[PDB]
Amino acid sequence: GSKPIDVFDFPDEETYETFDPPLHSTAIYADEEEFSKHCGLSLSSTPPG
Amino acid sequence: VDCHLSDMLQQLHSVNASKPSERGLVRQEEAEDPACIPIFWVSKWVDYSDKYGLGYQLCDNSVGVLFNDSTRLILYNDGDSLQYIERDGTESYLTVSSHPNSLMKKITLLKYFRNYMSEHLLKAGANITPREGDELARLPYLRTWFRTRSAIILHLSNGSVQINFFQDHTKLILCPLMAAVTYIDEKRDFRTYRLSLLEEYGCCKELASRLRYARTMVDKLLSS
Amino acid sequence: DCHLSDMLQQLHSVNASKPSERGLVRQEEAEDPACIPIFWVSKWVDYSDKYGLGYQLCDNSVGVLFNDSTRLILYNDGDSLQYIERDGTESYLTVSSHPNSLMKKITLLKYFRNYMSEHLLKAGANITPREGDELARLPYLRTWFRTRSAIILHLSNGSVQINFFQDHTKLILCPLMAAVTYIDEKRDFRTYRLSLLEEYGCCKELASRLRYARTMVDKLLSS
Structure with a gap:
């Protein structure tokens, strides 16, 4: 790696507030299986029959 | 739209005041105006x-x-x-x-x-074919909505108010620009009427009772 | 690295057999749930x-x-x-x-x-841990890189994991078992023996991910 580890301004509760990773794995909201399930248990318009 | 909801409230008060279902003769077919079919619905x-x-x-x-x-x-x-x-x-x-x-x-x-x-x-309304030039119409968005124990009420930004009844699947689409209402019955048949002609020709109790309910819901939309 | 070279040989053998170009693909015959990995990212x-x-x-x-x-x-x-x-x-x-x-x-x-x-x-929250697996040595991330289509993670126990961004599919390659675990776009988690994919075949989607895997293992060995 060529970029340094930048911990020269490190200590604390607001330092976690400035913690803003630009890229990460799949977020909790992006679970379509769970979304579709809640829709099935929630009120919706008429289904096929 | 406060001004569109106000016109629709007056339109509903008028037709409901005429008691369109309490008439010896009802000629609901004469109140139809296919030219008023809506462009957008939910x-x-x-x-x-x-x-x-x-x-x-x-x-x-x-x-x-x-x-x-x-x-x-x-x-x-x-x-x-x-x-x-x-x-x-x-x-x-x-x-x-x-x-x-x-x-x-x-x-x-x-x-x-x-x-x-x-x-x-x-x-809903899959049997309704589109007229020419309906693609040019500006696309509305949902301004506001709420649900009762019996229906969901959907107010679109073009002024239209739609009411879907849960149990029997009947639906109303109200258009204050034309002073018109489209009713989808239990058999999924579509029919569009002039509200002023319903006052003058009458209608069945199914549609009249839903127009009474609709007025109540429009008052609720105008409260908040 | 001895483990990367073994994995490369396995993937080369499987891909060279063109496993999606069979008259009848029987991918399910290669499944072996006894080879679930203990660790993944x-x-x-x-x-x-x-x-x-x-x-x-x-x-x-x-x-x-x-x-x-x-x-x-x-x-x-x-x-x-x-x-x-x-x-x-x-x-x-x-x-x-x-x-x-x-x-x-x-x-x-x-x-x-x-x-x-x-x-x-x-990811893989559905998979249940077996008994004795808590005795295993904890691996660490030896290296990683990011491409247009995926992130590649190389663990110190020899495992290589590849997570594809677009469709959320993931591969976990285990050279010790000559096995690959595939998590498809519905979050279904299945482990296959590579020797059996070579013999019985596999679908086009998995065959494509396995060619990508080989290119990425080649790159890990390059640097």
Whole structure:
């Protein structure tokens, strides 16, 4: 790696507030299986029959 | 639209005051005016208001969401064009391919809504064919909505108010610009009437009782 | 690396048999649930512009591969720590008792962990742990890189994991078992013996991911 580890301004509760990773794995909201399930248990318009 | 809801309230008060079902002769067919068929209505919807909000599809296959934070996101029927209406009404136009960073979440949630509706819900009014030039009409968004124990009430930004009854699947689409109402009966048959002609020719108790209920709901829309 | 070379040989053998070009593909005949891996990466955070790459393993331990090529791992007990220096040298400490020189990296680890626990979904959360698996040695992230289509994660036990961004599919390659676990776009988790995919075939989607895997293992060996 060529970029340094930048911990020269490190200590604390607001330092976690400035913690803003630009890229990460799949977020909790992006679970379509769970979304579709809640829709099935929630009120919706008429289904096929 | 406060001015459109006010006209519709007066229109409903008028027809209900004439007691259109309490008449010896009823000629409901003479109150029909096919020229007043609406362009847009809500064909599907999902109440995820516990977490995200209310998702819906319009009859042109466009999709929209009214999020709990009072913003709105509309995905046009091309599948790429997008319109975002902030809480202030501040409109903006973008594309799914643009992949906005501030809208990644809302876009993803809208796709989930779209996918559920397409794979699990029927399209209301699928037997209604589109007239020429309806593609040019400006696309409305859901201004406000609420549900009672018996119905969901959907107020569109073009002034239209739609009421879907849960148990028997009947629906009303009210258009204050034409002073007209479209009724979808239990058999899914579509019929469009002039409200002023219902006063003068009469109608069945099924439609009259729903127009009485509609007036009550329009008053509720105007309260808040 | 001996493990990467073995994996390359396995993938070369399978792909050369063109497993999706069979009259009748019988991929299910290659499934072997006894080869479920013990460890995989269940979340990750790429902060490589400032700090490095934090991750969670499926046993809920966490780790960071810092930009200076050292790694710090917190076990799922939430106190035990393992520090791996640039040359692989390993040392053991705890959150309550640690050299002061590691204080900043420990704090950084907690930020990664708190971020992951409150924002990110756990991949493979459905898979249940077997008995005795908690005795296994904890691997660390040896290296990683990002491409247009995927992130590639190389674990110290020889496993290579590839997560595809577009459709959320994932591969976990285990050279010790000559096996591959595939998590498809519905989050279905299945483990296959590579020798049996070569014999019985596999579908076009998995065959394509396995060609990609081979290109990526070739790249890991290049550098």
